[PDB]
């Protein structure tokens, strides 16, 4: 049975995460701490179609300018995969200020973030809307880039050793199951380098595209992490000391 604790959130900040593995992960940027006036438009819950000062749009705008001009955004952990439906494109790229904005304070998960990220925690209480020390949110910037939704994985990791890992998104994909030996060894070299991360278990996504692995994002060892193909009462299970991990695509 698995328990969640403060420093288990803390440690998959991308702001914690990405200075360990910048070389492994597409390019970003991160404002931290986040302005507080663009926090302030974060939290307006208003459903229909104030604003941060523009001194705080302006770095924005200068992050997306460094990246190439089209981005995807993200706060401390969740990325607004839930808000497609505020994009006129159905896409999370984003070339201007605006567009980040809005994506973002239309996202669940962004909200998510906001108001509950530490509410699973064993070791700290924040019922009084409280959040430990020294932590402040941040908005990332990450490059944007065309992905095949079909060739990015997720990775469960127990006792520094892969467990697991199966295909993250959701629609039959020929091509994985006649090249799944070449996809494993991949992640697998991947985790080699992810030796740095200071927890034992956590889940990592990967994004695989001509014989390359990238490193995606890092998130808690625990059920609030979407176990996708995989059940948690399985993953809690799994013995870690096993060779071969555990592997599933979605099927024909």
């Known amino acids: 049975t698995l328990i969640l604790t403060k420093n288990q959130v803390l440690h998959c900040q991308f702001s914690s995460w990405y200075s360990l593995f910048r070389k492994l992960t597409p390019k970003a940027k991160v404002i931290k701490p986040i302005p507080a006036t663009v926090l302030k438009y974060l939290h307006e819950d208003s459903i229909y179609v104030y604003y941060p000062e523009r001194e705080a749009i302006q770095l924005i705008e200068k992050a997306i300018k460094?990246?190439?001009?089209?981005?995807?955004?993200?706060l401390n952990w969740s990325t607004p995969k839930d808000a497609l439906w505020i994009t006129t494109?159905?896409?999370?790229?984003?070339?201007?200020?605006?567009?980040?904005?809005?994506?973002?304070?239309?996202?669940?998960?962004?909200?998510?973030?906001?108001?509950?990220?530490?509410?699973?925690?064993?070791?700290?209480?924040?019922?009084?809307?409280?959040?430990?020390?020294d932590f402040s949110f941040e908005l990332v910037l990450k490059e944007w880039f065309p992905m095949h939704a079909s060739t990015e994985f997720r990775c469960f990791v127990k006792s520094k050793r892969l467990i697991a890992f199966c295909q993250r998104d959701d629609n039959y994909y020929e091509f994985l199951k006649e090249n799944i030996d070449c996809y494993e060894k991949l992640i697998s070299d991947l985790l080699k380098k992810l030796d740095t991360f200071p927890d034992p278990d956590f889940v990592f996504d990967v994004y695989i595209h001509k014989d390359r692995a990238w490193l995606i994002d890092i998130n808690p060892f625990y059920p609030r992490t979407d176990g996708l193909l995989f059940s948690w009462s399985e993953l809690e299970s799994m013995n870690s000391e096993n060779m071969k991990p555990e592997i599933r695509l979605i099927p024909k």
């Open 66 to 74: 460094e990246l190439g001009g089209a981005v995807v955004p993200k």
């Open 89 to 133: 494109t159905g896409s999370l790229k984003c070339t201007t200020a605006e567009e980040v904005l809005l994506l973002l304070k239309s996202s669940d998960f962004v909200a998510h973030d906001l108001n509950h990220a530490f509410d699973d925690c064993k070791d700290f209480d924040n019922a009084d809307g409280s959040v430990p020390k």
